[PDB]
């Protein structure tokens, strides 16, 4: 099964999962100087005031933090969103040193690290029903860099040793979102995928343009996660992003 190696890696997922090459796939290159402000674009709106987080995963390719989306709690709407997306869960890709990581790219600049927080219309009832809609999720997508700490993180990465490999989870409950957001909003948006199989072209992607800093120490701990299950020889968790994929002339709009 797909993975991040040379052999399971993003560039053989087309082969179970052949929308890999579809038309409406992410990441992108986001070339500042081809996206166009759009006037016609709301404000964005991210209430994640009363935020359930219920519990932190590690799935084996990066670590989920789950939230309770039965009603509308943390939720996101405006900009390019036609009514309400609920926030199911968040996640990271990173690398294996600083120069790389994150999964968009701004004028083919990589990141140390990208986030994402994943939304699916209210509308379709569930997140299951919800991914089979062209307009069915939204992702508000993060750049991390690396120089001072991110205090609004540490409580993610002081809970990592408790689930160092696949499978484990710990309780996290009471975790705030609100502190992993920069200071501005204003963001790039373009229709698109997930990012990991399988790749279901349902995304309305939000990619804010101003990046968080987190620590060296922060993003090595990042690093000390594994990709394997406990009693396996241990394969570091890194480098788990997958790089951007061909625009096809889909338009890049800047909210700015
Ligand atoms: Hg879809
Ligand atoms: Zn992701």
């Not at 390719?61 to 509308?72: L, R």
């Not at 992607?205 to 990709?227: G, H, M």
Request: glycine fraction near 8%; charged fraction near 25%.
């Amino acid at each position: 099964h797909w993975g991040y190696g040379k052999h399971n890696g993003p560039e053989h997922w087309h082969k179970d999962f052949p929308i890999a090459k579809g038309e409406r796939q992410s990441p992108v290159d986001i070339d500042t100087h081809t996206a166009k402000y759009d006037p016609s674009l709301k404000p964005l709106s991210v209430s994640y005031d009363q935020a359930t987080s219920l519990r932190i995963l590690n799935n084996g390719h990066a670590f989920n933090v789950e939230f309770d989306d039965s009603q509308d709690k943390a939720v996101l709407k405006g900009g390019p969103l036609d009514g309400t997306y609920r926030l199911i869960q968040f996640h990271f890709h990173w690398g294996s040193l600083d120069g790389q990581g994150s999964e968009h790219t701004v004028d083919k600049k990589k990141y140390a690290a990208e986030l994402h927080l994943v939304h699916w219309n209210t509308k379709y009832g569930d997140f299951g029903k919800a991914v089979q809609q062209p307009d069915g999720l939204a992702v508000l997508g993060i750049f991390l860099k690396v120089g001072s700490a991110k205090p609004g993180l540490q409580k993610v990465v002081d809970v990592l040793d408790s689930i160092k490999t696949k499978g484990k989870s710990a309780d996290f409950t009471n975790f705030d979102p609100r502190g992993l957001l920069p200071e501005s909003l204003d963001y790039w948006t373009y229709p698109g995928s997930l990012t990991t199989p399988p790749l279901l072209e349902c995304v309305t992607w939000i990619v804010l343009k101003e990046p968080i800093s987190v620590s060296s120490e922060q993003v090595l701990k990042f690093r000390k996660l594994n990709f394997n299950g406990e009693g396996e020889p241990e394969e570091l968790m890194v480098d788990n992003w997958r790089p951007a994929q061909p625009l096809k002339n889909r338009q890049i709009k800047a909210s700015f």
